[PDB]
Structure 1
Amino acid sequence: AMKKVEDGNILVFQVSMKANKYQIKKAVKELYEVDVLKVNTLVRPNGTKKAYVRLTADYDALDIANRIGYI
């Protein structure tokens, strides 16, 4: 997941099983004040949902990650 942050400009999150792509995009924009290019989601084998969130070119995912608290 960390490789996709620095290289792909993509943030990886664990999200609730009831949330769709519209709600994930809305939540990220207000929680982290960023613009979202697109969202890809999958259901992991352990029963949780993982979302690949790619930010627009105006934002850098690495700067968001270290501001959130994880590097």
Structure 2
Amino acid sequence: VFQVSMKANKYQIKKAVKELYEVDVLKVNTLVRPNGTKKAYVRLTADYDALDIANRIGYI
């Protein structure tokens, strides 16, 4: 679950996840939160583990 700039679409979100984390993403679902920002649920493929890469980013 990421916070995303308001100008980004699902293509850009997917490409930038693949670049910044070297992860293949299955699908992206975005919404605009009531505070004015954008939230992206990024579901990865079954090969990668979001739990394994979240603490690699530095949060869990």
TM-score calculated relative to the size of structure 2: 0.99
Runs of 4+ in structure 1 over 3 Å off = none
Which segments of 5 or more consecutive residues in structure 1 lack a partner in the other structure? 1-11
For 2:12 and 2:23, locate their aligned partners in 1 and report how far apart those are by CA, in whole Å.
15
- Paired residues, what number? 60
Bigger relative contact order, structure 1 or 2, given CA contacts below 8 A and separation 6+?
Answer: 1
Unaligned runs of 5+ in 2: none
Q: Give the share of equivalent positions with the same residue, in percent.
A: 100
Cα RMSD of the aligned pairs, angstroms, is 0.3
After TM superposition, the score normalised by the length of structure 1 is 0.84
Q: What is the alpha-carbon distance in structure 2 between the residues aligned to residue 44 and residue 22 of structure 1?
A: 20
